[PDB]
Amino acid sequence: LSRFKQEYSQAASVLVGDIKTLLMDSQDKYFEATQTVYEWCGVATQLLAAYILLFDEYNEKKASAQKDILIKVLDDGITKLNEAQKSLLVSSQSFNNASGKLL
């Protein structure tokens, strides 16, 4: 009955430890994701703001650029935003196996 106390200590220990690793893993991946977003979400605002400004009255010369710009910045964040989600989703999926082993 000492063995009992032992064997399970062993298991729980190593599992509980992996769980922490996993938790910590997520945290970093969350940070990345959010941070990545906060970065784009930030340049973006400046550009949308500019677009709203420079085209109060139609600016015929900058028109073609503004368009190309709106596209790049939007297209870009759209991608970046997507990947953020997938990164996060995958982090969520990570705990699943462990969660079972726990039970």
Partner: protein
């Protein structure tokens, strides 16, 4: 005599040298956990600090895409970049 004389006390002695080492070790662990966590902090807080520049830079770039090398925005953006950088040197 011999038992209660040297034996039992000897055992009570190791039980202590163990309990003694168990402690120092447990603390040697608390340290590492604190050291590791401190490193991870420094890292991300740097990551994000670099982030500040990145965004400014990334913006300024787009402004260059207007073509108007004289556009107040691109000009201001370029001035800000020099500030944002300067502040990065002082704090960090």
């Amino acid at each position: 005599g011999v038992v209660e004389g040297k034996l039992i006390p000897e055992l009570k002695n190791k039980l202590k040298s163990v309990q003694n080492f168990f402690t120092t070790l447990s603390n040697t662990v608390k340290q590492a956990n604190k050291d590791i966590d401190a490193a991870k902090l420094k890292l991300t807080t740097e990551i994000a600090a670099i982030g500040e520049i990145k965004t400014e830079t990334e913006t300024t770039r787009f402004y260059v895409d207007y073509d108007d090398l004289m556009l107040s925005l691109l000009k201001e953006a370029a001035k800000k970049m020099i500030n944002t950088c300067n502040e990065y040197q002082k704090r960090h």
